[PDB]
């Protein structure tokens, strides 16, 4: 794990993380569109945030040792500042797993929208237009709050985080 200076993006929970070129160099020959890492934030006193897997993309314009991460990935969104670095670890030997199912807890308005679609394949495609969930690319995580009061991931299976295969992963929708 390396320490990297941290900037929080405010453009959706599933915006990819941007990493500086020195971090990108740690992956070597890996395919530049398929990069993942684990992020943990430092916490009040001992210990740190639990490891969260994210898709990362090179941003050549960032200064050294820098990452940009969505603030919505973590407990609260910054209305006042907090901590100026994170612990970042590239994923090198491993690949990221595909979920068998994802369960969304959604408000009545969104549920009706999803329910006026007779097909499951277009239910995930609809969430893909609303939220930048991309098949076999975006990592989703249990308890992710996509929009306060509208949409939250209740659970994933068999792992608490992983990729969504639009043709394979099962979508479970729960009215709130």
Numbering used by the authors: 0 to 175
Describing publication, verbatim:
The heterohexameric ATPases associated with diverse cellular activities (AAA)-ATPase Pex1/Pex6 is essential for the formation and maintenance of peroxisomes. Pex1/Pex6, similar to other AAA-ATPases, uses the energy from ATP hydrolysis to mechanically thread substrate proteins through its central pore, thereby unfolding them. Pex1 and Pex6 belong to a family of type 2 ATPases associated with diverse cellular activities (AAA)-ATPases that form hexameric complexes consisting of two stacked ATPase rings, D1 and D2, topped by N-terminal domains. Unlike these better-studied homohexameric AAA-ATPases, Pex1 and Pex6 form a heterohexameric ATPase with alternating Pex1 and Pex6 subunits.
